[PDB]
Design a binder for this molecule. Sequence first.
Ligand SMILES: Cc1cc2c(cc1C)N(C[C@H](O)[C@H](O)[C@H](O)COP(=O)(O)O)c1[nH]c(=O)[nH]c(=O)c1N2
Ligand SMILES: Cc1cc2c(cc1C)N(C[C@H](O)[C@H](O)[C@H](O)COP(=O)(O)O)c1[nH]c(=O)[nH]c(=O)c1N2
Lengths: 182, 182
Amino acid sequence: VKTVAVMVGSLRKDSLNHKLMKVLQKLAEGRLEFHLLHIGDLPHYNDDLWADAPESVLRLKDRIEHSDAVLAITPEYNRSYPGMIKNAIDWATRPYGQNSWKGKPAAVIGTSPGVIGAALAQARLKNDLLHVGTVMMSMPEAYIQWHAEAYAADGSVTDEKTAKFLQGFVDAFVDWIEKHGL
Amino acid sequence: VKTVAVMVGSLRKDSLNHKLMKVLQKLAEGRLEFHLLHIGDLPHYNDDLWADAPESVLRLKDRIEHSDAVLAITPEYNRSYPGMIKNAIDWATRPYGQNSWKGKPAAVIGTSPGVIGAALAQARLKNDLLHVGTVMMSMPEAYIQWHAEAYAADGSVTDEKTAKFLQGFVDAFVDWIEKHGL
Ligand SMILES: Cc1cc2c(cc1C)N(C[C@H](O)[C@H](O)[C@H](O)COP(=O)(O)O)c1[nH]c(=O)[nH]c(=O)c1N2
Ligand SMILES: Cc1cc2c(cc1C)N(C[C@H](O)[C@H](O)[C@H](O)COP(=O)(O)O)c1[nH]c(=O)[nH]c(=O)c1N2
């Protein structure tokens, strides 16, 4: 089993990206073990805080470093991804010389109720995670328009086409981690 | 005098982007009146909070709406701009139908100790502010490598070449607001 440090780019109760995380976790059970990064617990980045580092920042870095891979699951806000994710990215690259992300196999996925499926957010997040040294998966693209009727309450995917698609993403990520991980 | 809602993308005590804000404010005094947007006081975006909107969010939107223009002064973190700025951007676009940024003349500037002068951050921030409906100034580019010896403690620019350059940016922004504002 490979461990995955997961960022979900939404805090709200009924987040679709949180639902997507659970769907992916269920599809991946037995092959990937997800551990959430608690990005909502991070203060806004402030370099002065390294004098007494926030526990949340220490925990963030420890989990990334102890995980085999990274997965980001992002909504799209105003045609890019949420700042809360970028704030987490930046915290874990520091202190200088201590970039936790370096060399980690990564992937990005996300969902929107709209047909664009968070594609613009995803492209930007792929670029920004590439620029902190991750080994970034590109295929298959997964710009998911959320359809509530395609999923069950337990996270099962009831729609066969959607299940095949998401399974293809999971399978690719498993293979990506095996090939490109440390 | 035109009013300007200003974002400074750093919270730390000795921030160079904060020093740059004060330099620009001094150069612009009498023509532009700066009002800081308190982006460090915003919680991480969470759509659930609109049920009881945070005061910081309400103040942010009110100041943007009541200003003639917007100025962002950004550092570069891992080849883009800080998430705290994107978080502010997203808050002020909401609720749906109530985008405070729409039609506002805007400009972006920033500084780094390195020679790249926060250019990658600035390009991304220009794009993200364009995508929320600002009327975005592009010229002159201002990718400022910070040189402490070029500035005095009162914000004066002691280096003549630097003063001419930053005055050019301020003059262009005043004209931009006059031409492109409401
Ligand atoms: C500030 C802000 C900005 C945007 C959005 C929302 C909000 C609040 N939404 C809608 C978004 O896709 C929808 O609310 C998702 O359901 C949010 O993801 P979670 O459900 O919270 O995971 C959105 N959707 C979209 O497809 N493209 C976009 O650019 C935006 N922009
Ligand atoms: C997490 C993080 C990431 C980066 C930086 C710093 C930190 C803490 N810095 C350096 C940055 O330019 C320098 O610290 C500036 O002085 C920060 O701006 P303020 O001085 O806080 O306004 C930096 N500089 C740069 O030119 N390009 C970059 O990609 C980054 N990345």
